[model samples]
Target: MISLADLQRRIETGELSPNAAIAQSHAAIEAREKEVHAFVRHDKSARAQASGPLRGIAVGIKDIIDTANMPTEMGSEIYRGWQPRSDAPVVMMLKRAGATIIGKTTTTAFASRDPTATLNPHNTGHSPGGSSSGSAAAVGAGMIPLALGAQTGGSVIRPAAYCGTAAIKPSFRMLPTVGVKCYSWALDTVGLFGARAEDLARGLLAMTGRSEFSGIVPAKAPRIGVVRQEFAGAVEPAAEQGLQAAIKAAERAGASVQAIDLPEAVHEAWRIHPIIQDFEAHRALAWEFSEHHDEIAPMLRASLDATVGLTPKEYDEARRIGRRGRRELGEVFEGVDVLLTYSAPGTAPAKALASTGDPRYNRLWTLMGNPCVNVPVLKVGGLPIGVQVIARFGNDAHALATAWFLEDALAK
Candidate 1:
């Protein structure tokens, strides 16, 4: 896969000029979007803006991320042709660092239960996971080297796994979500996507200007903790095999592998995730639900309905549980630097299944606010499923670099 680093190198060496690379990105979107339907809008007049860390890199912003120059319809009928007055903070950071905004990509309706027209790059008949579906597909199809995604739940990592792209849902609040719309004010997080982990590492470091997010892939293997999430359908057979193979690969390359289970309190933490989300969602969209009632999709309308009588007292209790989860999560990695676990239930499911697969394996990680990276190295039934590497709450670098280490280990 072509990468931001690859593009940067070629541009630096004069092997390929920045604008030339930018032009190729346009050509790729033109060639693939009809079949992939990854984008909601393509900017016909986009030009390379700067030559910094991500020189010539093309990125697809999730439609929900407001972009001043492009229409931000957010994959909803109500906001069609709606343009923001300014770019989201994440977008501004990318633009300041020489990344070109290719266009806004498709998203689920208001990034809720409603599905989008996006098709998986691995198999068009199957759904690419949402609501970061288009962002993941654009990079997976070789249409763009970088993209932005958000994970209110498992929106970022799950789609990256199904679409076979590398992604980093960094430690909560690592990237600015200021200009991005809110889903769960407590859980919505800005995420990064690329064709490979190294690309995300570099892009993240550049975007944040922080050493913590930089990728210095470990030369030696890391201690791998395999998590057995006890929930039903938490780990699929194919995903189990994919994980086992990865464990073997890591051990052969000088790593330690062992089983680890979350404490019962942590396990029970999952129950609070939805309560917190529902309560937050009920309030986050209050204006819209009050003003544009009929414009809301049925699936989302029902979710909001469930919150009709949700009280602040209940939300506070749920928030208390969320805090407990964050505090207790550190115990899961006492002797290990990272835990390798399921990124999703399996590979992409049929697009007509009326679902976007499962997020049971992912919700806890987001709830804990730990750094998570999707390693897209496993193929099941000829389509990719991913294993995630999660680390201490503040150790974004460790989680990212460990995933990159494993990615390089398997390459040999």
Candidate 2:
């Protein structure tokens, strides 16, 4: 995978010209696009700025995000060739930081259940994991240094885990969703994918110009709490191995580690996640489902159809539970700087599975509005298993730094 941090350092040191860096990315895309299909479309003519923190970086935008320069198809026939008049605010953030918008990556239909045709870069026969399939695959395949992906429920982190790339589902609303296609406005949080934690930190820093994501690890080692999320169901042995590996690595690196059980309210949040998601999804895709009933992807169509019966009273009750969950989750963090858990149930499903794997492990954190990072810890049978590092709401910096620490420790 392309390293955004390495490229930026080279650009800063005059070891590589900005345009030359971009050319390298273009060449990579040209060579890999046929088999990887990580991009829906890319602009050979796209050029980076001469100056800015991310001057030489090329980025892939998920298809659901509006882009005036290219189509925002949302991986659905209903949005075929749809072009907005302006870039999404998040895109504008990247543009202003001097990154080139190389192209739009493929997404699952409406960033929902239906999978994109995009193949996993690590193993083409297996799923890439959607709805941010193209973004994760693009970075994983080394076609680009950075990419944007939005996660309503594990879209970004799970795909990155499957592709063996670093990814983060930042605190809710950390990145603006003004122009991205809405799934559940409350659950949908924009995120990033890159080669490693440093790359993600650089991209986030440049995009937001915030010092919090400035690639600086804390001097004091983090106190890590491990959560098995038993309610999410048992993970495959490989995922459990990955978590155990991360726990040992963190402890060996001088961090204190311990097991912790989350409060019942947080467990209830996991149970009611779909209520919040489906309730809003029904309204979020109102026009699409109503006008293009037949064109909507079958899985998403069926989902909306089934969830249509969810009453407003049910949604309100779920939201109330969610609030309590968030509060209890905050208290959980008072004892630990971050929580570690499995990023997914297992490796990317074999192509025969014909489905994006479950989001059960991730939905709870997304609901709690915490910042979560998926670190590519270990691989079993040539496919990677990621361990998730989660920080309290608004503690994104600690999350990134501790994740970096875990990544480094594992490498050693």
Candidate 3:
């Protein structure tokens, strides 16, 4: 896979031209696009600026995000030729950082529950988790060095796990979501997928101009809290093994580790997460759900139908529970630097257009607005699954550093 940091270092040292770095990605697209279908469309002639920290980077924007230069078809026929007059703020951030917008990657319709036509980079027969399918797959397959993806569910982290890429779903609103399609106003977050934990840090540092994300090396061992998330339902044995492997690695590296039992309020918040999501989603997609109902994807259609009756009373209560949950979560973070948990229930399942894997493990953190990083720790049965390192709501730097620490530990 292409390493964003390595590419930038080469460009900085005059070992590689900015255009040469971009060409590396363009060439990979030519070789893998046919099989992976990660991109909806690409520019073979895309050029890179010869200045800035990210000059040599090539990035794929998720199709749901507005890109003035691309169609942004959104993987659905409802608005087949849709184009935004301007780029999303996040897209502009990449451009300003001198990263070339190489292409538009595939996303589920509306970045919702439906599956995309994109194939998993690791095994074509297995699903690449959504709604960030293409972003994760592109980086995993080495088609690009970096990609933008958004999460309102397990969209960012889960797909990264399935595709074997390092990803970060930063603290909510850490990256603006103005032009990206929104599934849930509260849960939606902009994120990135890259080759490794350090790559994620480099990409984020360039885009956000956050110095903390630069030179990220843990000064001391982190206090790690392992959360099994029993409330999320049973994880496959592979996921269990993956979590164990990460904990063992952390312990071996002299980090203090312990299992955590989340508060009941947090448990209740998970149960009501859908209430918050579905209620807002119904309104967010008002135009499409009301006018283009027939064009709505089956998975999201039934989901909307099932939750149509969620009243304001329930939603209000859900928000109340969420607030309590966040408070409890904050208390927990006081004792632990980071919490580790399964990035997904398990490895990617066999490819099935009818269903993408579950997001049960990710909803609570998304709701709490914490920074979560997915580190690809191990592979099970030839498929990759990962453990997520989660930090307090605005401690994205710590989250990245701890995840980087864990990634290095697991490598040893």
Clashing pairs in 3: none
What clash count goes with each model?
A: 0, 0, 0
Using all chains and alpha carbons, the TM-scores for the candidates as numbered come to 0.97, 0.98, 0.98
What digit string (tens of lDDT, one per residue) describes model 2 on residues 1-412? Answer: 9999999999999999999999999999998889988788798899979889999899999999999999888888887778899999999999999989999999999999898888888889888888799999999899999999999988988998999999998899888999999999989999999998888888899999888877576325789999999888799998898989999888888989999999999999999999999999999999987999889989999989998899999999999999999999999999999999988899899878779889999999989989999899988888888999999999888888888999888987
How accurate locally is residue 316 in candidate 2, as Cα lDDT from 0 to 100? 99
1-412 per-residue lDDT for model 3 (tens digits)? 9999999888898999998898888999999999999999898878988788889799999998999988898889986989889999999999999889999999998888788888888899988889998999999999999999999888999999999999999998989999988889989999999998889889999999988887887526899999888899889999999999999989998899999999998999898888999999999999998999878988888898888898999899999999999999899988999999999989897885456689999988999999999999888777898999999999998998898888888988
Lowest summed lDDT over 10 consecutive residues: which window, candidate 1? Answer: 212-221
Ranked candidates, highest lDDT first? 2, 3, 1
Top of the candidates by lDDT:
2
Q: Would you give me the overall lDDT of model 1?
A: 0.85
lDDT of each: 0.85, 0.91, 0.90
* Cα lDDT for residue 248, candidate 2: 89
